[PDB]
Every structure is written in structure tokens, then in C-alpha cells.
Coordinates of C-alpha atoms in Angstrom, one line a residue:
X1 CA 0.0 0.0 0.0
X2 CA 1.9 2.8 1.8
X3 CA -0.3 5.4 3.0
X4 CA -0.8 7.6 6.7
X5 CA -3.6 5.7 8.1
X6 CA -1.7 2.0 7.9
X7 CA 2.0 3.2 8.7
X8 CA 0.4 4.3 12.0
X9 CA -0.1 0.9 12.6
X10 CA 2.3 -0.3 10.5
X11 CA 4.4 1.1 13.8
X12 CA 2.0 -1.2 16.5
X13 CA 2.8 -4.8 15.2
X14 CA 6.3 -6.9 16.2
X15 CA 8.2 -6.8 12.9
X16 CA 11.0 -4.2 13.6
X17 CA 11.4 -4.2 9.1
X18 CA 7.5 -2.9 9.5
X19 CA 8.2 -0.9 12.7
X20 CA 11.2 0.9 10.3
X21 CA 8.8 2.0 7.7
X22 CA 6.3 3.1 9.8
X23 CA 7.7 6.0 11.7
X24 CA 10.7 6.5 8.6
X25 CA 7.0 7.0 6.5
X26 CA 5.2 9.6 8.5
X27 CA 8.6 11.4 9.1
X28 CA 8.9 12.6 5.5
X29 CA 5.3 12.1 4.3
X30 CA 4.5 14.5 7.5
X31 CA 7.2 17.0 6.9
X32 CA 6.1 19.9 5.1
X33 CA 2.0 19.8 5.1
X34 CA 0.8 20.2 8.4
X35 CA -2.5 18.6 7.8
X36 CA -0.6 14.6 7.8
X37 CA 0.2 15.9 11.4
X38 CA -3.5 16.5 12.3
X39 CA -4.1 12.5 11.0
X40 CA -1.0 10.9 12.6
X41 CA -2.1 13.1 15.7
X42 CA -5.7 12.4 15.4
X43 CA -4.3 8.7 14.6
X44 CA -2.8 8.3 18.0
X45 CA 0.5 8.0 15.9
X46 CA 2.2 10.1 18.7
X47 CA 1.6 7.2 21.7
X48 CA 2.9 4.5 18.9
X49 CA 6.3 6.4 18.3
X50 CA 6.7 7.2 21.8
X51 CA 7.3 3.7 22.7
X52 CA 9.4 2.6 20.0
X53 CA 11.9 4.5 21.0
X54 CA 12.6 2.1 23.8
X55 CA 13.2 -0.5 20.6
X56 CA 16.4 -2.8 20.2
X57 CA 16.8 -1.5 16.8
X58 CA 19.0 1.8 16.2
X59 CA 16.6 1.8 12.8
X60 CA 13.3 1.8 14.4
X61 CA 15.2 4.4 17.2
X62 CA 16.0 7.1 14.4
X63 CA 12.7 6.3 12.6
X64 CA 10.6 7.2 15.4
X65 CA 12.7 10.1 16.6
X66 CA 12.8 11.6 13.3
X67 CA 9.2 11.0 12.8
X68 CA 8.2 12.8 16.0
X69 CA 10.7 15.7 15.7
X70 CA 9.3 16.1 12.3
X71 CA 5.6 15.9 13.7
X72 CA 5.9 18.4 16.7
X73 CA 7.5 20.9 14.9
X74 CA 5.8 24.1 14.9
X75 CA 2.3 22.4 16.2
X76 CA 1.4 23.7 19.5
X77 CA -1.1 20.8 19.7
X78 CA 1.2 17.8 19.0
X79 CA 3.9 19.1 21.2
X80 CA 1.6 19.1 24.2
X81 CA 0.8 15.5 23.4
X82 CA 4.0 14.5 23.0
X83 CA 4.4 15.3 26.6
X84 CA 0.9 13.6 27.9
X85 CA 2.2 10.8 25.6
X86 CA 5.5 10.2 28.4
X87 CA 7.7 11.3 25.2
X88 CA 9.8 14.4 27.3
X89 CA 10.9 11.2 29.5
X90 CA 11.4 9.0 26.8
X91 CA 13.4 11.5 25.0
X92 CA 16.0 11.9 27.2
X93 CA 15.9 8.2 28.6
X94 CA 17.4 7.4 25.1
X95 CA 20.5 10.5 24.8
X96 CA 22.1 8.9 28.3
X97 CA 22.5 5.3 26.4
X98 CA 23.3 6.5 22.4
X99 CA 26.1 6.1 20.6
X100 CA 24.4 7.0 17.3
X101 CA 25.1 10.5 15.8
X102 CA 22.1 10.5 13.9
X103 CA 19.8 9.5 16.9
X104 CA 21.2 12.1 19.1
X105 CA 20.8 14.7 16.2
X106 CA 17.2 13.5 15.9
X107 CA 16.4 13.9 19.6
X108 CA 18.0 17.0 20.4
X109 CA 16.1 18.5 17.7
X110 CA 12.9 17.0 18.9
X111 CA 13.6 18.4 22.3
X112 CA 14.6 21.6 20.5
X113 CA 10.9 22.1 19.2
X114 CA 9.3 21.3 22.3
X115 CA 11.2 24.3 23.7
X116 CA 9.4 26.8 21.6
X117 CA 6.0 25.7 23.4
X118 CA 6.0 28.4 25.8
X119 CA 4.4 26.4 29.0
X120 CA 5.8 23.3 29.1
X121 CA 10.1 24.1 29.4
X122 CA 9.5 23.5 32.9
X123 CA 9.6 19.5 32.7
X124 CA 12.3 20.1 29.8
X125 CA 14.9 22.2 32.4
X126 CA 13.9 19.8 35.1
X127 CA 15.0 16.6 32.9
X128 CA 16.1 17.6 29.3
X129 CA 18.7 20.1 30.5
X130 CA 21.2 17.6 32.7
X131 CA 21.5 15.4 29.7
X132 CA 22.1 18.0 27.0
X133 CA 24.6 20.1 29.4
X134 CA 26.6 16.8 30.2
X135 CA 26.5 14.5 27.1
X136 CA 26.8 17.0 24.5
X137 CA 27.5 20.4 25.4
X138 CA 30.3 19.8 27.7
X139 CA 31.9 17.6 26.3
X140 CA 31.7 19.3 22.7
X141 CA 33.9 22.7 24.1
X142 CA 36.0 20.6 26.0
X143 CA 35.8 22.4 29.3
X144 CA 37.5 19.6 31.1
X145 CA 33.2 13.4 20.3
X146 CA 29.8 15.0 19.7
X147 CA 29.0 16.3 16.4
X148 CA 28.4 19.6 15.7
X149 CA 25.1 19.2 14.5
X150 CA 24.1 17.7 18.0
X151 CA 25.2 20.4 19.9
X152 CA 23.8 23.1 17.5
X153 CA 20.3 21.3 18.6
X154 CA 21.0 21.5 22.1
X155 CA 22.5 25.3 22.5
X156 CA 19.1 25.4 21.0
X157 CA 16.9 23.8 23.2
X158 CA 19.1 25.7 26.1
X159 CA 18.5 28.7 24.5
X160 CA 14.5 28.4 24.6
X161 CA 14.9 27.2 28.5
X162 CA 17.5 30.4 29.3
X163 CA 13.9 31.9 28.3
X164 CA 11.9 31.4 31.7
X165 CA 13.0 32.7 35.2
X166 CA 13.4 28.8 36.1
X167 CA 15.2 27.9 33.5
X168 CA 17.6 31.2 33.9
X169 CA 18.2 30.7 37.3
X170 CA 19.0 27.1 36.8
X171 CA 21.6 27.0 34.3
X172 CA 23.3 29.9 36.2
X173 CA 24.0 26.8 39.2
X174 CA 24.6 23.9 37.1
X175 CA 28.2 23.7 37.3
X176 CA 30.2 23.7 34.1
X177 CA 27.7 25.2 32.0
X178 CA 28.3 28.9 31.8
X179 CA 31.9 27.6 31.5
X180 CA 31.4 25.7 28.2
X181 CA 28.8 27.8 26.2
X182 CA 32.0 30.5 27.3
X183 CA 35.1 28.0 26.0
X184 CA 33.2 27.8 22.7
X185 CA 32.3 31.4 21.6
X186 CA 35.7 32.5 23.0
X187 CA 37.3 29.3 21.4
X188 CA 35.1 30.4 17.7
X189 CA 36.3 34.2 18.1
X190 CA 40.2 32.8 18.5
X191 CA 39.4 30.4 15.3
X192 CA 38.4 33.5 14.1
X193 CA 34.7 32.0 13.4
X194 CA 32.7 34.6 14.9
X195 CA 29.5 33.4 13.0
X196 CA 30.3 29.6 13.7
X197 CA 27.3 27.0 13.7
X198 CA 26.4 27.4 17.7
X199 CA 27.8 31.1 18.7
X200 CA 24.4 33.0 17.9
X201 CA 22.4 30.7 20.1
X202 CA 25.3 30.2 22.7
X203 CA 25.6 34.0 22.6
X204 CA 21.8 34.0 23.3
X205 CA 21.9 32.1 26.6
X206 CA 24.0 34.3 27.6
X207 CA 22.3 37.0 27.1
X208 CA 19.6 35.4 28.7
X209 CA 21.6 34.3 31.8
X210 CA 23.0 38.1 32.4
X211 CA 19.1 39.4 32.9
X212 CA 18.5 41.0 36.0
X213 CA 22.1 39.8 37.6
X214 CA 22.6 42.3 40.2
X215 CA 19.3 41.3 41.6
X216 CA 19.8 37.9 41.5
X217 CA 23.4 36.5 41.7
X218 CA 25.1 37.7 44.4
X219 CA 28.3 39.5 44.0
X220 CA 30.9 41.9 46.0
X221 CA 29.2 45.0 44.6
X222 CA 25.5 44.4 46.5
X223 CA 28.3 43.4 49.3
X224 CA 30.2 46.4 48.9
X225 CA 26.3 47.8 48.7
X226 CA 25.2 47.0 52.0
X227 CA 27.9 48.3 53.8
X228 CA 28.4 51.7 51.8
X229 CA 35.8 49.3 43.7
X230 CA 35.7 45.2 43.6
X231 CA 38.7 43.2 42.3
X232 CA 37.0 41.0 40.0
X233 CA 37.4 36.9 40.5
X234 CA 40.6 35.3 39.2
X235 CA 39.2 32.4 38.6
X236 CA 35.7 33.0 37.6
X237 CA 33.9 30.0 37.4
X238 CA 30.2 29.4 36.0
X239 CA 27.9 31.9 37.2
X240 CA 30.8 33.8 37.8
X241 CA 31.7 35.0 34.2
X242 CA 28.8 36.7 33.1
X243 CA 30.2 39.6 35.1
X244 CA 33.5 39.5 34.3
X245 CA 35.7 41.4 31.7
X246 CA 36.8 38.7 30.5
X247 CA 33.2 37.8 28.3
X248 CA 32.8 41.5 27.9
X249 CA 36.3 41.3 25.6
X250 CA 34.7 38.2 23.7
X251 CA 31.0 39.7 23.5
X252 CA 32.7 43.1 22.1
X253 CA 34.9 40.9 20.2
X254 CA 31.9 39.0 18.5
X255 CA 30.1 42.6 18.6
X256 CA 33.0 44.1 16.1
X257 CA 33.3 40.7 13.8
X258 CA 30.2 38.7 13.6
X259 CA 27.8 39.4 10.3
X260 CA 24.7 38.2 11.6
X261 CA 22.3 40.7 13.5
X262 CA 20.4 38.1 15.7
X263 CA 24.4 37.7 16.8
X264 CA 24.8 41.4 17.6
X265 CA 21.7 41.5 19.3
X266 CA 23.1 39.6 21.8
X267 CA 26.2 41.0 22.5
X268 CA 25.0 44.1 22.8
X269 CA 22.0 42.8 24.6
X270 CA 23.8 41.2 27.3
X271 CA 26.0 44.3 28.0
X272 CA 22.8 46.4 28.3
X273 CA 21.5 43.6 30.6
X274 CA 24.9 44.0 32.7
X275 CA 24.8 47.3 33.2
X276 CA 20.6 47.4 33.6
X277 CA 20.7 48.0 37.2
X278 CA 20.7 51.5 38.3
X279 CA 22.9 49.7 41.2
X280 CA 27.0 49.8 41.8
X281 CA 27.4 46.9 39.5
X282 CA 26.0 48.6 36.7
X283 CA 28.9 51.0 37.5
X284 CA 31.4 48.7 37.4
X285 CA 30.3 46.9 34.4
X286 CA 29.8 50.0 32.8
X287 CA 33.2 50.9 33.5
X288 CA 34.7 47.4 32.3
X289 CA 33.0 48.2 29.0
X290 CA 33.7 51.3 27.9
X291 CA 36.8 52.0 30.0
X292 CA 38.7 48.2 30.5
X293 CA 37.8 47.1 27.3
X294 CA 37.4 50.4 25.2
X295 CA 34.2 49.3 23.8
X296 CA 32.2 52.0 22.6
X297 CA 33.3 52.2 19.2
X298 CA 32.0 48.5 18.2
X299 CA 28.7 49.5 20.5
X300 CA 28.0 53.2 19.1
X301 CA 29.0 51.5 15.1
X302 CA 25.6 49.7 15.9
X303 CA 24.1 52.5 15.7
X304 CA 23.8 52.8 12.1
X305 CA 22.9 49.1 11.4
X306 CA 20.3 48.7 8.6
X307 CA 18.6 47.2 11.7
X308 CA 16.4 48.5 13.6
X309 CA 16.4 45.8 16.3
X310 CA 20.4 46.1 16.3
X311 CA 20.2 50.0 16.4
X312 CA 17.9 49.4 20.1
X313 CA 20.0 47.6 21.5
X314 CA 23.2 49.6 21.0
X315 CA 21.3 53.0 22.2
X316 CA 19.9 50.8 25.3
X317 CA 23.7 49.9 26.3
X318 CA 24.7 53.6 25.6
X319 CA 22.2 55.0 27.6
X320 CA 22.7 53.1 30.7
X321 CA 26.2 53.2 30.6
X322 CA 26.0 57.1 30.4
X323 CA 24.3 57.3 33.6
X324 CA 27.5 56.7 35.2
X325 CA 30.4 59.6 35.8
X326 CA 33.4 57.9 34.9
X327 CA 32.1 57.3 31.2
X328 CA 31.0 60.7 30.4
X329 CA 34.5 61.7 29.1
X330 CA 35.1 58.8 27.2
X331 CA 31.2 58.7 25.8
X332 CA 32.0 62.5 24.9
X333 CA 34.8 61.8 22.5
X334 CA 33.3 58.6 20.7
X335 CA 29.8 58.6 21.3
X336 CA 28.1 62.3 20.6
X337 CA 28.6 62.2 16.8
X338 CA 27.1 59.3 16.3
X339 CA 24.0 59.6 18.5
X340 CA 23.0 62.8 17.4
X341 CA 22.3 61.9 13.8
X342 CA 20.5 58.9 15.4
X343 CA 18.1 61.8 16.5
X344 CA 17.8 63.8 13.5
X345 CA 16.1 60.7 12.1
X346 CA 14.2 58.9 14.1
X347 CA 10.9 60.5 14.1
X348 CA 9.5 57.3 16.7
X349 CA 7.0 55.9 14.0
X350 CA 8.1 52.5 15.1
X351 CA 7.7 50.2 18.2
X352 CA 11.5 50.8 18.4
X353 CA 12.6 53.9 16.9
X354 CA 10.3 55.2 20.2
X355 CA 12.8 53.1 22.2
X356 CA 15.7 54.3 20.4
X357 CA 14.9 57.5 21.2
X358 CA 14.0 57.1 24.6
X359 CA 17.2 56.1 24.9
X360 CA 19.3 58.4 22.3
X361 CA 17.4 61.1 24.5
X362 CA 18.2 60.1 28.1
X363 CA 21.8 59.8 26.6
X364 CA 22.4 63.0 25.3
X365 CA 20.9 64.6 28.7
X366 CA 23.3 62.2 30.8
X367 CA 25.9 63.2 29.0
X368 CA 25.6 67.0 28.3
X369 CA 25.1 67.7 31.7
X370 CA 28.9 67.4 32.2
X371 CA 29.8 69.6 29.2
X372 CA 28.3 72.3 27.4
X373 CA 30.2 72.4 24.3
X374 CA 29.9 69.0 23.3
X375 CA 25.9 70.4 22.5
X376 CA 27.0 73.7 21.2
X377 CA 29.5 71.1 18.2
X378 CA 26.7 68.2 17.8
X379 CA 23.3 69.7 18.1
X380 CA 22.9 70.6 14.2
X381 CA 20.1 72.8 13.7
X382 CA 18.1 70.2 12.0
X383 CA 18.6 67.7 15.4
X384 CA 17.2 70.8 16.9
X385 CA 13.8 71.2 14.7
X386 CA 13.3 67.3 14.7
X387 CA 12.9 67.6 18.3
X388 CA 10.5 69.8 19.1
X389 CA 7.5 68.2 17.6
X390 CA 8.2 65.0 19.4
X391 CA 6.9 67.1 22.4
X392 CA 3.8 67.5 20.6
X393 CA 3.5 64.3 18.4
X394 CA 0.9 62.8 20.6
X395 CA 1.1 59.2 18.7
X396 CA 4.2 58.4 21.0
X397 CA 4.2 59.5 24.4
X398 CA 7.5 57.8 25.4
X399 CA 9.6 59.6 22.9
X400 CA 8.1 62.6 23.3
X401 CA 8.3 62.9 27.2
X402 CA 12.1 61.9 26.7
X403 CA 12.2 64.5 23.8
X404 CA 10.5 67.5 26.0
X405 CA 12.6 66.6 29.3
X406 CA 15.9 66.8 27.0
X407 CA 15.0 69.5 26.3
X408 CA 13.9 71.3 29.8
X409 CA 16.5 69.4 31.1
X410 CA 18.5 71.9 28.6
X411 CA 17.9 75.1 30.5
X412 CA 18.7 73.9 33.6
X413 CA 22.3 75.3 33.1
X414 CA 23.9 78.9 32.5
X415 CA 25.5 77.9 28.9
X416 CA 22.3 76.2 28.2
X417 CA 20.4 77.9 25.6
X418 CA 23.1 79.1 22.8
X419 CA 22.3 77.8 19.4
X420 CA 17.9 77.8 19.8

């Protein structure tokens, strides 16, 4: 024959050679449709593969791992069965005792789907994560073989988890892990790979892992907080980098190479992250950034990324990072130029360009407040008309209230009024 309806079953009876076809037939048949998913669903296909997996045959392994990664993918409803199903346990019960390549490819990308579906990551971090962070990302940076196309899967499976509070908090303790996803992107910046296979998503846990960090690791700065500079760990270990100058040098160093936006994103995303928290670590990190590391040129070239997504997060670091003292110098002679014209442009028409401003505004306020005559060289008269309106422009109160109190904010000195 061949068909849907019969492979189904085709999987149910006790010849492995008809147990093969079965799941091998409804992984490609139900690839691209979306419609053979509702029938294999509506089938009960999903119980039938489930069990398989605990098969003696490598063959009728792959087959039904294939066949369910294929069959989840992007289906809210199928992914939630697979779960009801026992398949989340089943998964992972088969990655601790593989040697197969292609059947830990299979599952890791299975797993990687289910990590898209919002609600259910929770039994994922609870038992995926252990198995992916030991068997194949460890192992795969060599933090002390796992192809590449296994741990590709897995950084993205991690990368949906380092989505939830849970999952954020718990990858921050499991020792090792931090430490590996850092070996690799600083390893693929040294091979000079800054756009390898796994660095965007690596470089998006990380990003992940470094939200609200002040507030939730602890560190010397909420000590030296209580009580009220820091040295900075020698040996920073798991948790411990994400705060240390040493992944601000590779995350500007991915920042000044890497080609791919989503890539960017990150790196500049973490740093903003870093340096988010109106605390004394956001001083410090500030400092490490633009003053260790001299980083505002790769940050403020963001700024005039064909991307607006890229262009936000840039602005966001800048902002934050002028709100500190000790970077107002340095943010004066590298910074001024280029955020001006990124406010003789963006009129705030956009979900971001309102955020961009926001933040180009708060900026330029921080920063001026130190020293007149950077306004009186970079406020072109142009800059100056495209800011007014914002005031008014009622279709965007956040740039406008940032636009308006840059610009009180710009009497509130002696030397404050020249050009207008």
C-alpha cells in the first residue's frame, strides 16, 4: 500500500522491518503539510512512536525520533501531546545510552521544538537540560566526540529554556555550564569564526543568563552595597563569568566581527543587561565596558545598522552606561557624533525607533550635563527642529516625554540655551 492511516499501525505490530517503515514513512510524508500531522495526531500516531523509542533497533530508534521531531515541529497541539504521551521522559531516557550520531541529532532537535512551546520548558529544564549540558555540550567545548550538529540542537533547546525565570536561574548553578557555552564562543572568536554554527544561540543564553544579575546573583558589589571598587574573581567559574571582563572582551569581540544581527543582538543585549541596574554593579560593568575594554566604538557603530532591532540595543547599552560619571569623558569623544544623527532621524514611527529615542534622548541629557560644548559642536540645527514636535507628536508619548525633558532638562544650566 503505503499510505498515513496504515504506517500508524504499521508502527503497533512486532516486525522491527514494518516498525522501520512506519515512523521513517510519516517522518517525511509528515514533513512539510501540516495537515498529515492532524491525522498521525488524530491517529494516535504520537503514543505509537513514543514507545518505539525504547526499541532494540538503532533503525526503528531514528525512525521514530525523526518521525516525532518532524511531527511536533511548529504544532502547538502535538507538542503538548508528545508530553501527555510520556515522550519528554522518553526523549531523554534514550541520549544517556546512544552512541548513534544521527539518533542524538534526531532527539536533540525533537527536544529543540518542544522548547518553543511556551508552558511546558518547565519538565524540559527539570529533565532535558542535565543530559544535553553533560552529554553534548560539555563535552563538545571541551571544558574539562559530539558532532556539531548535535550540539547546534542543544545550545538550542538551552537557548528556549535560558527563556523562563526557572530555567535562567538554573543554568546559572549547574556547574560547568556557563563555562562551556563560554570556551566555545571565546574558542570560535580565537578560530576567528565569529559566526560559527552554535555562537548566535550560545551567545543568546547568555544574554539570557545576564538578565536582571545584580538582583539575583550575588556578588561583591550588593556586598560592597550593604555596607556603603571590587577586584574582580581570578578564577571566575560558571555563574561567575557573566560579570567578568573577560566575556565582555569576547562579546565586544563577537560585537566588532560577527555578520549576523540576531548575533549582535546579543552581544550588545547582554551588555545592556549588565549594566541594567541602576545599582554599583552597573557602574562597574559600565566601566569594564567602555573604559577596560574600550568598547564604545564596536557599540556606538551599531548605531547605524540597517537594523532596527540592532540600532535598540546599541542606544539601550549607551544609555545606561552614560548614567555613570566615569564614562561621560570617554562617551563624549566617541559617542556624541554618532548619537546625534540617530536623532535627526528617528521621528519614533516604530515600536523601536520610540525606544531608540528614549534612549538616544536620556543619553544625550546624561551626558551633556557634564559639558556644554559638546551640545553647542553636535546639536545641528536640524537635530534641533526634529525635536520639538516630538513634544507634541501625541502618537508616541515615550519619545516625546524623553524629547520634552531633554529639552527642559537643557535650561537647567547657565551655557544652556546658545544655538535655539
Amino acid at each position: 500500500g503505503l499510505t498515513i492511516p496504515k504506517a500508524v499501525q504499521y508502527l503497533s505490530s512486532q516486525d522491527e522491518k514494518y516498525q522501520a517503515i512506519g515512523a521513517y514513512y510519516i517522518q517525511h510524508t509528515c514533513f512539510q503539510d501540516e495537515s498529515a500531522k492532524q491525522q498521525v495526531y488524530q491517529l494516535g500516531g504520537i503514543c505509537k512512536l513514543v514507545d518505539l523509542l525504547r526499541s532494540p533497533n538503532q533503525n526503528v530508534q531514528q525512525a521514530a525520533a525523526g518521525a516525532l521531531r518532524n511531527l511536533v515541529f511548529r504544532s502547538t497541539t502535538n507538542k503538548l501531546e508528545t508530553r501527555r504521551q510520556n515522550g519528554i521522559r522518553e526523549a531523554v531516557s534514550l541520549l544517556r545510552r546512544t552512541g548513534n550520531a544521527e539518533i542524538q541529532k534526531q532527539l536533540t532537535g525533537l527536544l529543540w521544538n518542544l522548547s518553543s512551546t511556551d508552558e511546558l520548558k518547565e519538565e524540559l529544564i527539570a529533565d532535558a537540560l542535565p543530559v544535553l549540558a553533560d552529554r553534548v555540550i560539555i563535552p563538545f567545548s571541551g571544558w574539562c566526540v559530539v558532532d556539531p550538529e548535535v550540539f547546534f540542537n542543544a545550545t538550542g533547546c538551552l537557548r528556549n529554556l535560558s527563556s523562563a525565570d526557572a530555567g535562567r536561574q538554573t543554568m546559572r548553578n549547574y556547574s560547568g555550564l556557563i563555562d562551556s557555552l563560554m570556551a566555545y564562543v571565546q574558542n570560535c572568536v580565537a578560530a576567528s569564526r565569529c559566526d560559527d554554527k552554535s555562537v548566535e544561540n550560545c551567545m543568546c543564553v547568555l544574554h539570557n543568563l545576564s538578565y536582571r544579575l545584580d538582583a539575583e546573583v550575588p556578588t561583591r558589589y550588593r556586598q560592597l552595597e550593604y555596607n556603603a571598587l571590587p577586584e574582580e574573581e581570578t578564577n571566575p567559574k560558571g555563574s561567575g563569568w557573566l560579570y567578568h571582563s573577560d566575556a565582555i572582551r569576547t562579546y565586544l569581540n563577537l560585537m566588532g566581527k560577527s555578520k549576523k544581527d540576531a548575533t549582535l543582538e546579543a552581544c550588545a543585549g547582554a551588555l545592556q543587561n549588565l549594566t541594567a541596574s541602576k545599582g554599583l554593579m552597573s557602574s562597574g560593568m559600565s566601566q569594564l565596558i567602555g573604559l577596560k575594554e574600550k568598547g564604545l566604538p564596536q557599540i556606538a557603530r551599531l548605531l547605524q545598522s540597517g537594523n532596527s532591532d540592532v540600532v535598540r540595543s546599541g542606544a539601550s547599552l549607551l544609555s545606561n552606561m552614560s548614567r555613570h560619571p566615569l564614562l561621560h569623558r570617554v562617551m563624549g569623544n566617541q559617542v556624541f557624533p554618532e548619537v546625534t544623527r540617530l536623532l535627526t532621524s528617528h521621528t519614533g514611527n516604530t515600536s523601536n525607533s520610540e525606544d531608540i529615542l528614549s534612549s538616544a534622548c536620556y543619553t544625550v541629557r546624561n551626558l551633556m550635563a557634564s559639558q556644554p560644548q559638546l551640545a553647542k559642536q553636535y546639536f545641528s540645527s536640524s537635530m534641533l527642529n526634529n525635536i520639538i514636535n516630538l513634544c507634541r507628536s501625541s502618537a508616541s508619548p515615550k519619545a516625546a516625554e524623553a524629547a520634552r525633558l531633554l529639552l527642559s532638562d537643557m535650561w537647567s544650566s547657565k551655557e544652556l540655551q546658545g544655538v535655539l
